[PDB]
Design a protein around this nucleic acid. Structure first.
Ligand SMILES: Nc1ncnc2c1ncn2[C@@H]1O[C@H](COP(=O)(O)OP(=O)(O)O)[C@@H](O)[C@H]1O
Ligand SMILES: [Cl-]
Ligand SMILES: [Mn+2]
Ligand SMILES: [Mn+2]
Length: 555
RNA sequence: AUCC
């Protein structure tokens, strides 16, 4: 049937100059030594990505699909969604959102300047009146940081980002923002993965696991998901949106966004040249996350029925999926997974790596993470979310004139606070750096799901207790997998081994303690793992007082 | 210089 993309041969050009690594990395050169291994993707590789994501989709649905989709529409029909006012939508624009071609930017949008508001009014009017003319988009290469991988070819090509003008982006929110906040939760319930903190994700997976008489679990991820989404998938997404009760004006804008933007359209590079035409998900539109997540769910659940998965419990985040189910014996389990993959493949969601059944929860990786186990203060098993620290360490070492890595250190410290790598390596580095700079009490930003939260370093103990529990400060006897993976990642980036971080941490602890106040609390709680004779850590009063519920939720 |  349809090609994901077609190309005119015009280059995908840089969206500004692309920042230079420097000869000295003064904030991370005591974290690790192999700076040569840390790179950022750029437009120079966009052509290679374009080639890998351009292909012909043929899609073949069946009765399991029809049946799932039907259930999902019923579920959607219970949702009432409203238009956002033009002004509400304006003010949800992020502060550095890329400016309009029409002579205004995010500052103006967010402040509701008259020029910007009037442009947007007219964009909205045109959406209500013209349901057909394709809306032009810009295509750009994503700049992201990774550690080189010789196994997988050295350096990954840049992902492709496709987005419409700022004025349209505002209009998307008027039409769909309220739906983005309600629909996924309504159609998926507990299966919607972007509602859970790391501890909650763990709790849910363990509960799912313990509920089966004889569990089997697997993960799945689609190769290049956005390019595999069909025009028909996208119109099906609309029909799911339209099943909610909406005012008529929303219906009209939603249909018009669908036909003019979401299903496809022409693409221009940053120099304004025609670059290509698209017939798949534009990653960059408002509906990217909701769309990916709902369409993944529909396909996956239909594929579960097709393969005969018994008592499936799912967890879906975009195109990342875990399914925990009742094992039918390893022989049938393996057949069932092949049938799952074949069905997903008919549905136009082929796998990156073929999935495989597992019967031990530590061995399942989804959303770049997995559940592991360690022992707590009282010797009980304690489960928590971890990941390979390779990419976090590489991002910990991205330092340019334009970019400081300190916020990424913080982000990882918060999300992965119970992990051996955060506690021994990143915490030790973070605190050492800030003490020496004398910036310990200076607020930093925590970035998550596109939101930004201001955090003071000296409040970490309370934040961590609240988010992960007091046991995050007393885990020991980490697992073989985790010890092996962390040691290996450190060697690979030329970082000191864990025993050296332990010595460093003793010294960081003592300095923190010597400063008194909140600093000393950080030393006692965050680095109790580092001393010979432990302290008895007690609940922090400030922790009871904190509400962090918005950090890890969409809705 | 995309969206959640
Ligand atoms: N930075 C991003 N901006 C917008 N959308 C994204 C981003 N990262 C991932 N996505 C969306 O989620 C999908 C799945 O991502 P992933 O599994 O990480 O890679 P792939 O695109 O190869 O499947 C993407 O195809 C894209 O539509
Ligand atoms: Cl314990
Ligand atoms: Mn994928
Ligand atoms: Mn994925």
């Amino acid at each position: 049937s349809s090609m994901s993309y077609s190309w005119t041969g015009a280059l995908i050009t840089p969206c500004g100059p692309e920042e230079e690594k420097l000869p000295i990395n003064p904030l991370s050169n005591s974290l690790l030594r192999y700076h040569n291994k840390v790179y950022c993707t750029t437009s120079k590789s966009a052509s290679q990505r374009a080639k890998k994501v351009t292909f012909d989709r043929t899609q073949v649905l069946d009765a399991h699909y029809d049946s799932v989709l039907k259930d999902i529409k019923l579920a959607a029909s219970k949702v009432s969604a409203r238009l956002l006012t033009l002004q509400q939508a304006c003010q949800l624009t992020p502060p550095h959102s890329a400016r309009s071609k029409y002579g205004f930017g995010a500052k103006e949008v967010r402040s509701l300047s008259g020029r910007a508001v009037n442009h947007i009014k007219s964009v909205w009017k045109d959406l209500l009146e013209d349901p057909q003319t394709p809306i032009p988009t810009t295509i750009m290469a994503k700049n992201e940081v990774f550690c080189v991988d010789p196994a997988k070819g050295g350096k990954k090509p840049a992902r492709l980002i496709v987005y419409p003008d700022l004025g349209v982006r505002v209009c998307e929110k008027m039409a769909l923002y309220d739906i983005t906040q309600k629909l996924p939760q309504a159609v998926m319930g507990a299966s919607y993965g972007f509602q859970y903190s790391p501890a909650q994700r763990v709790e849910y997976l363990l509960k799912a696991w313990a509920e089966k008489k004889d569990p089997m679990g697997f993960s799945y991820d689609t190769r290049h998901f956005d390019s595999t989404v069909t025009e028909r998938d996208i119109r099906t997404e609309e029909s799911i949106y339209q099943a909610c009760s909406l005012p008529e004006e929303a219906r009209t804008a939603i249909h018009s966004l669908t036909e003019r933007l979401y299903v496809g359209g022409p693409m221009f590079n940053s120099k304004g040249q025609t670059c290509g035409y698209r017939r798949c998900r534009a990653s960059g539109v408002l509906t990217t996350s909701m769309g990916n997540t709902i369409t993944c769910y529909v396909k996956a659940l239909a594929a579960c029925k097709a393969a005969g998965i018994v008592a499936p419990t799912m967890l879906v985040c975009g195109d990342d999926l875990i399914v925990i189910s009742e094992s039918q014996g390893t022989e049938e389990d393996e057949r069932n997974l092949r049938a799952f993959t074949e069905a997903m493949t008919r549905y136009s969601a082929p796998p990156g790596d073929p999935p495989r059944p597992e019967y031990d929860l530590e061995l399942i990786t989804s959303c770049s993470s997995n559940v592991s186990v360690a022992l707590g203060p009282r010797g009980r098993r304690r489960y928590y979310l971890t990941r390979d620290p390779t990419t976090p360490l590489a991002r910990a070492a991205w330092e340019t004139v334009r970019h400081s890595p300190i916020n990424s250190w913080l982000g990882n410290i918060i999300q992965y606070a119970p992990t051996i790598w955060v506690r021994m390596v990143l915490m030790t580095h973070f605190f050492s750096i800030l003490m020496v700079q004398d910036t310990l009490d200076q607020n930093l930003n925590f970035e998550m799901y596109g939101s930004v939260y201001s955090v003071n370093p000296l409040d970490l103990p309370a934040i961590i207790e609240r988010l992960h529990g007091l046991d995050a400060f007393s885990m020991h006897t980490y697992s073989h997998h985790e010890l092996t993976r962390v040691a290996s990642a450190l060697r690979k980036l030329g970082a000191p081994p864990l025993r050296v971080w332990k010595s460093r941490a003793r010294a960081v602890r003592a300095s923190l303690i010597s400063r008194g106040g909140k600093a000393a609390v950080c030393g006692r709680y965050l680095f109790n793992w580092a001393v010979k004779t432990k302290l008895k850590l007690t609940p922090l009063p400030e922790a009871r007082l904190l509400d962090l519920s918005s950090w890890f939720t969409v809705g």
